[PDB]
């Protein structure tokens, strides 16, 4: 050494700049969010047909579709959206601890959403439909179940970014990472508002 030639705040830099420059992981996750919205368009088209097919009282007889356990976990998940947005408010202002508290409770009630969805799947498969049992049961298990895989991947992103906040100095690059995971998971629970309006309310 003499001092360094890369005399910066860290080895990691923001992504370009963000005062007169757009954040680039921001626009990267925005267009990848848009791609995953088209993935959910594939799942929605697998739902909105195979509901035009079944006529009459079309959600079939073994599907006592539970709303009294659905709307609490949607309310948990969309309040957790505001907890995650408060986490990114505490990420712009640079303290790791305001980030980590709100993302810990966001991860906890997102895990509560995943466990509530898993208990809904157990309670709806043990006295009802299976994924080879019905048309509507199969499309219910895939249109919201792979959304369960989306939200469990978002939870993996939460615990992963929390270990990342444990291991390094809070750079503006790490606030970029935090805002990126923040509105990835905001996209997850706006797609779940769409799915909960679609499956349960609108039918």
């Amino acid at each position: 050494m003499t001092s360094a030639v890369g005399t910066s705040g860290t080895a990691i830099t923001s992504r370009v700049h963000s005062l007169n420059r757009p954040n680039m992981v921001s626009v990267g996750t925005i267009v990848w969010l848009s791609s995953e919205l088209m993935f959910f368009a594939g799942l929605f088209a697998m739902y909105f047909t195979a509901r035009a097919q079944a006529g009459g009282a079309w959600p079939p007889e073994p599907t006592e579709l539970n709303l009294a356990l659905a709307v609490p976990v949607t309310l948990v998940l969309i309040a957790s959206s505001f907890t995650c947005q408060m986490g990114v408010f505490a990420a712009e202002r640079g303290d790791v601890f305001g980030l980590r508290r709100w993302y810990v409770i966001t991860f906890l009630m997102g895990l509560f959403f995943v466990l509530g969805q898993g208990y809904e799947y157990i309670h709806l498969v043990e006295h009802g439909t299976t994924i080879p049992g019905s048309a509507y049961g199969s499309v219910f298990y895939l249109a919201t179940g792979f959304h369960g895989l989306h939200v469990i991947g978002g939870l993996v992103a939460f615990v992963l970014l929390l270990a990342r906040t444990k291991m390094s100095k809070f750079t503006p690059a790490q606030a970029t990472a935090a805002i990126v995971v923040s509105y990835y998971w905001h996209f997850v629970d706006i797609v779940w508002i769409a799915l909960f309006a679609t499956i349960y309310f609108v039918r």
Binding site: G6, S8, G9, T10, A11, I12, D95, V96, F97, R100, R101, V104, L162, T165, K166, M167, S168, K169, F170, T171
Partner: protein
């Protein structure tokens, strides 16, 4: 490079004078480690 997070907890920060004492002491200990190893390396050849 950038290896200085908050020393506080996983949820709550420690007061700032304690953070300064911990990171200055750990930085001086790592500096003393490479200093003692470098002066031993110079003792082998010199």
């Amino acid at each position: 490079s950038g290896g200085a997070p908050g020393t506080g907890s996983f949820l709550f920060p420690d007061p700032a004078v304690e953070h300064e004492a911990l990171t200055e002491a750990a930085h001086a200990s790592e500096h003393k480690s490479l200093t003692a190893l470098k002066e031993h390396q110079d003792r082998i050849h010199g």
